[PDB]
């Protein structure tokens, strides 16, 4: 067909003095600076392809901008006629060269104008082939997946290893999740293995809540050690293309990083929910026995309910919105990598939650534990001495006591009628002293007390002895020993064993001072629920920390994003308008996340369930794994353990 | 020939009234009251006669002063002159007749002076016969034999039969000899068989001291049961003539009293010494307890030197003294029964001897049962307590095994080593309570200690079990149990049922104190030792009764001896020459011997025998003949070989 008259202008034609374009060769000899409007020479255009050369970087880009400026800059001149470059040659560039708008702009001839490019003409260079494809900067990669390109540069993709980190942070960072993960994952298996052995009695409901405490950390350890397994680690961070996984759940990738978030997240937040059960369960002990509270054995339904569907709700969140991002260094998907707000929402303000409801019923159980010993500080000291030396213990016992919050009454066995003498105390403490040449006989003032103890009220009543003797006399403190032989048979419970004596109580004033410390260690306020209260305090300690982590991360991480993309941005290269001093880089990171706060972070988190898994390291454990091997060994045979078997 | 002047004196014949002189007709028929100084008339000289023939009674005088009387009371007057009685006649009279002047006095005419008895002169009486010879009366019986006449009254003798006692006393007590001579005899025949039957392991020291102590019993029944045979109670009581024999060895007499007396005597002393040995061999024995050291080793010799020596010393001394006397009531001759002092002497001072020396025995014994002895008893109580229930059983059972003389050491099983931990005591007491919701489990503390008990030295220990539990659990005290399995399947040897306390112990705490006072008793102690202490003061308690019964008769004999004598010659009569002036006879016993006190000293005495005899009435003793009849039928505990 013959040319259109709109698809040409008139133009003076000049032989080509270059016979390639952008690395292909052109089929005609002569050409026209008439359409760019920034040349006027061959050796002009010439150079201006070289600036625009730069642009081989974001390839979907450079790949259609070739055609068209060999259409423009060097065109075809034939018969006083340059040929015009078609509408949809230019059309073609607009959208993957948006970062030429974005960075100098589209120069007036570049413009895709009906004038300047009209519509339905031959190109020409649509003949020509241009194989040059252009590549991408370290930090970005090559995809095809238009779901992985970084903004503007379209073509490449974020590469799956954060660039903020080398290779030795993330070998440091591995071996350190590696080694905090194996130690939770075994002692907490160590604690759920302790309570299935002994499952119908470990049920109760006071220490069961540890059970489940561990069994969350437990599924957590799982998470956080999946990625070492041979190949995970880029299963779970890295796209099938090869780019970090960002805004998971995402359409055609493998479920391997939403599998590893659910296991991470959902035991991170059953397990802070698990805390505040704890902090609840200690606190409403007390009043159990103290005031009217009743026992809270049997709230199964109320406590499993809430600890298993509020992380629930929380995770289904997190999918639905979409969050769910992928990091090679911490080697799992969590919730708000790529978006600091997410990470806040869903991490920090429900750690920010438990630890006030947590921590109100830490402050409640103590005032509760503190008003009791008040209720229980009344203690009567009867004392028997000829020469003073038991008068003397019984005055150095009596300010420990009143140091220690006891109002004390110290009366001398002489002036006290034995009826009804006890009636009214929480402890009760007789001393008397030994005497008798050739036997055991009690101090004078003491015999008519002793005689009619049956009438003081020790029944039931807390007693310790305590007395004055000599080593040089046969029957060592024997006052001593008869009288806590007499307040057992009577049904006195002796708290601990009778202080005895030897020689002047002045030169043993720090034994009397420590075994009036120790008799009021033994007035037990529940050893089975004072373990119970130390976990409750350490856990807070440690989910405190977490927090504060999460907290710094929440209150930084939008300078460490601005600085992400100033960096990845900048080593992308594409700088189009002019040639950099020297081929280097001149790309920095201004400021990244803290490592050290992030294996902080680690040690707080890990670190509770191996403090929650000492809550099975006593002797009875040892007792409950003997009944599993002896019984193991009883059922080797037929049947079981028997009532004479 | 003719009659001599100084044979004759003047006086008026008178014609004789009376034909007849004390029973014998008189040749004559003229008589003379010249010689008879007391009489004036023949009535009076008659009624004088009628005084004189009182003394029918003591024959021996009766005899001989018939003729005498006629002589000088009716003689013969012939022409004016009175026949004068011989010297010789008178002087018969003298001696047989010597209670006349013991009671009354020879009067003035009758002594024998040569103006009124001349030298060889014809009696007349010389031809008169006297067929009269007297009698003794019913306590008394005639003996010719001299050395058996009694006392003044001379031709009678006392009866063999003891007159203080009737025939149905004699009956009454033989029967009484014969019950427990008999008794005594068997039961000490059976324990001196055994020990016989088995002499070997029998002749130890501290038990064969009741072997001897039986034999003397036994020799001493055989006495006392002699008087049993045919006829031998009067062989061995009575003389050849019939009266009873006093003061033996006697000269011309059977030995058969002298026989039964030192049968009797010397079993009696030498059972009383063997009491004293017994008593000290105790006493020695049993404060050598604590050591090998064997007391009575060399005391064997000096033991039987004692015991059988003392006896023969004092048997023979009153031989010596010849105190033997018969007696028929007891139907055996023994010493002091004519004399009192001589049986206080031989008899009441011996016996009272063996008590203080016995006494003294038996006392320092019983200072050694509350003394301190070399050896005490070990014993460890470990226990196992989670709320203190265990640990006050512990406590308890601990003051009450102290208070008992055990060396307690109570530990708690949470501080101890199984390694060696029961090597050293004699006794070890574990207490546990139990635990566990579904099955048996022991106390926490207690488990290290019971999976390592093999390694603790249970193996043939002296062991018993305690503990607390609950009836409102399955498995009561199921520990308890598990405790005296292992140690049972280790070797150990269980006491006693475990004390299995239901709920509180302080409300059960004498059952407590009663179980531990048990648990002391299972553990075997010396019974021969405690045996032999038992019959030292059972033989004492019969030795101070028969010591008691002798002492009785001691302090009353020297009244019932003259009430002997004052009876006996009271019943006979003599009557020199007294109108009795109108007496009453009333011949009475004011007092006499109790055979009461007689009956209690032999209960006491056979009473002795068969309490010792009671030494070999064991279930050995039962083995002893079993093995006796098989060994002397040939076969062994089945067939010999
Ligand atoms: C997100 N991020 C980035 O580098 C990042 C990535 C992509 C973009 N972007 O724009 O595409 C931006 C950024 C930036 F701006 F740098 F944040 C850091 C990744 C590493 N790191 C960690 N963070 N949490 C945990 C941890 C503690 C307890 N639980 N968990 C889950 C953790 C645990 C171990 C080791 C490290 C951890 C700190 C934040
Ligand atoms: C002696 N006498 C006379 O009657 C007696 C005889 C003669 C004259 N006299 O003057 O010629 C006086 C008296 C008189 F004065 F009455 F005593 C009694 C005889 C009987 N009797 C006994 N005596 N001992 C024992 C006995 C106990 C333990 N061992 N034995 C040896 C005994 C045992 C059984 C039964 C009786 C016994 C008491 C004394
Ligand atoms: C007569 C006499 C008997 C004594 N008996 C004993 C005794 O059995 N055991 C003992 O440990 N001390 C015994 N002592 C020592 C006293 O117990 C000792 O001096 C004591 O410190 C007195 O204290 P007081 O002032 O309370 O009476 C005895 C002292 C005396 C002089
Ligand atoms: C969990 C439990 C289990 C128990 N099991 C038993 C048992 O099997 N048999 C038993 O007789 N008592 C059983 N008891 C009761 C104790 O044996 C009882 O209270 C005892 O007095 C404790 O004594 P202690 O102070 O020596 O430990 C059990 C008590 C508890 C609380």
Redesign the interface.
């Known amino acids: 067909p013959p040319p259109l008259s709109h698809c040409g202008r008139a133009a003076p034609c000049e032989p080509l003095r270059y016979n390639v374009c952008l690395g292909s060769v052109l089929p005609y000899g002569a050409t026209s600076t008439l359409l760019a409007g920034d040349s006027d020479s061959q050796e002009e255009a010439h150079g201006k392809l070289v600036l625009w050369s730069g642009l081989r970087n974001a390839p979907r880009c450079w790949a259609v901008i070739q055609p068209l400026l060999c259409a423009v800059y060097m065109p075809k001149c034939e018969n006083d006629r340059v040929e015009l470059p078609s509408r949809t040659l230019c059309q073609a560039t607009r959208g993957p060269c948006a970062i030429v708008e974005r960075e100098r702009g589209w120069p007036d001839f570049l413009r895709c104008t009906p004038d300047r490019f009209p519509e339905g003409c031959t190109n020409e260079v649509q003949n020509i082939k241009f194989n040059s494809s252009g590549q991408c900067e370290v930090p970005l990669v090559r995809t095809d997946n238009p779901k992985s390109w970084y903004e503007d540069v379209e073509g490449c993709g974020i590469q799956c290893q954060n660039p903020l980190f080398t290779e030795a942070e993330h070998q440091d960072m591995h071996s350190y999740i590696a080694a905090f993960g194996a130690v939770t994952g075994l002692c907490t298996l160590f604690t759920l293995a302790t309570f299935v052995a002994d499952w ?2 470990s049920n109760r409901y006071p220490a069961v809540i540890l059970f489940y405490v561990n069994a969350c950390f437990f599924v957590g350890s799982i998470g956080w050690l999946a990625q070492f397994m041979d190949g995970a680690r880029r299963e779970i961070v890295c796209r099938a293309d090869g780019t970090m996984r960002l805004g998971e759940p995402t359409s055609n990738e493998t479920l391997s990083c939403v599998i590893i978030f659910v296991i991470v997240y959902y035991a991170l937040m059953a397990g802070v929910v698990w805390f505040v059960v704890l902090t609840y369960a200690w606190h409403t002990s007390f009043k159990a026995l103290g005031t009217t509270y009743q026992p809270l054995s049997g709230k199964t339904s109320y406590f499993h309910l809430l600890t298993w569907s509020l992380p629930f709700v929380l995770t289904v969140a997190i999918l639905a919105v979409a969050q769910v991002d992928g990091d090679s260094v911490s080697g799992i998907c969590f919730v708000g990598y790529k978006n600091y707000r997410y990470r806040a929402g869903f991490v920090l303000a429900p750690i920010g939650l438990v630890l006030i409801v947590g921590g109100y019923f830490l402050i409640r159980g103590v005032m509760t534990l503190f008003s009791i010993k008040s209720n229980h500080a009344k203690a009567l000291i009867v004392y028997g001495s000829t020469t003073g030396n038991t008068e003397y213990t019984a005055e150095t016992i009596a300010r420990e006591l009143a140091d220690a919050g006891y109002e004390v009454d110290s009366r001398d066995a002489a002036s006290v009628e034995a009826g009804g003498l006890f009636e009214g105390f929480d402890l009760v403490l007789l001393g008397c002293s030994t005497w008798g040449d050739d036997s055991i006989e009690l101090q004078d003032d003491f015999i008519p007390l002793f005689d009619s103890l049956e009438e003081t009220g020790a029944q039931g009543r807390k007693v310790a002895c305590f007395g004055c003797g000599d080593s040089s006399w046969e029957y060592f403190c024997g006052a001593v020993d008869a009288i806590e ?1 007499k307040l ?4 006195a419970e ?1 708290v601990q064993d009778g202080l005895r004596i030897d020689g002047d109580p002045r030169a043993a004033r720090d034994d009397i001072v420590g075994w009036a410390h120790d008799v009021r260690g033994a007035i037990k306020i529940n050893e089975t629920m004072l373990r119970l209260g130390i976990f409750g305090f350490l856990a807070f300690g440690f989910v405190l920390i977490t927090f504060s982590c999460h907290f710094y991360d929440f209150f930084n991480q939008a300078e460490w994003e601005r600085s992400f993309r100033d960096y990845v941005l900048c080593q992308a290269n594409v700088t189009i308008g002019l040639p950099t001093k020297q081929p280097i880089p001149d790309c920095e990171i201004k400021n990244r996340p803290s490592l050290l706060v992030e294996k902080i972070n680690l040690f707080a988190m890990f670190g509770t369930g191996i403090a929650m898994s000492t809550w099975v390291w006593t ?2 454990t040892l ?1 409950i794994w ?2 599993t091997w002896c019984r193991l060994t009883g059922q080797s045979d037929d049947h079981h ?1 028997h ?2 078997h």
């Not at 057992?488 to 049904?491: A, I, T, V």
């Open positions: 119908r009695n032989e057992k048979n009577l049904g002796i002797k009875a007792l003997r009944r353990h009532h004479h």
